[PDB]
């Protein structure tokens, strides 16, 4: 996923609960591992026969 911890510094008033971002980082990191998925690829380069 292209989210992985929103980051983005921001500050407001009367709507910012101090400990609201703490759980957010961990939740985003947890949801990021579930989306991870490898994707290997191979192609022929060169060869020869003797």
């Amino acid at each position: 996923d292209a989210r992985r911890l929103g980051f983005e510094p921001i500050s407001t008033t009367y709507d910012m609960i101090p400990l609201s971002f703490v759980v957010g980082w961990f939740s985003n990191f947890d949801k990021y591992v579930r989306t991870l998925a490898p994707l290997i690829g191979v192609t022929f380069e060169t060869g020869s026969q003797n």
Binding site: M16, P18, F26
Partner: protein
């Protein structure tokens, strides 16, 4: 799987630091608050701000480490690798004669 060892390491084995953030939070910024619940209304006019200013400063101090961790996250998705090789041979006896 041995080709992803270092990547998994730098992905999560170092990410435990992020988990260490919530530890200090749960330990101090919500457990030590047992004093606010016992004070009379005459002290809530001050304790609320006393706690809010202390938590906002901690969040601000947290912010840069989150940036470093995010920068480290991008280091794991760099398409870099090498090449694998193999070889195969076979023989077939043709003829033979004594001497």
């Amino acid at each position: 799987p041995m080709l992803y060892k270092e990547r998994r390491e730098t992905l999560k084995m170092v990410g435990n630091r992020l988990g260490g953030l919530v530890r200090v939070a749960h330990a101090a910024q919500d457990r030590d608050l047992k004093r606010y619940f016992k004070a009379r209304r005459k002290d809530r006019r001050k304790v609320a701000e006393e706690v809010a200013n202390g938590h906002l400063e901690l969040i601000f101090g947290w912010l840069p480490l989150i940036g470093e961790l995010e920068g480290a996250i991008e280091y794991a998705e760099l398409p870099d690798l090498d090449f694998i090789r193999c070889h195969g041979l076979h023989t077939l006896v043709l003829q033979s004669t004594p001497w």
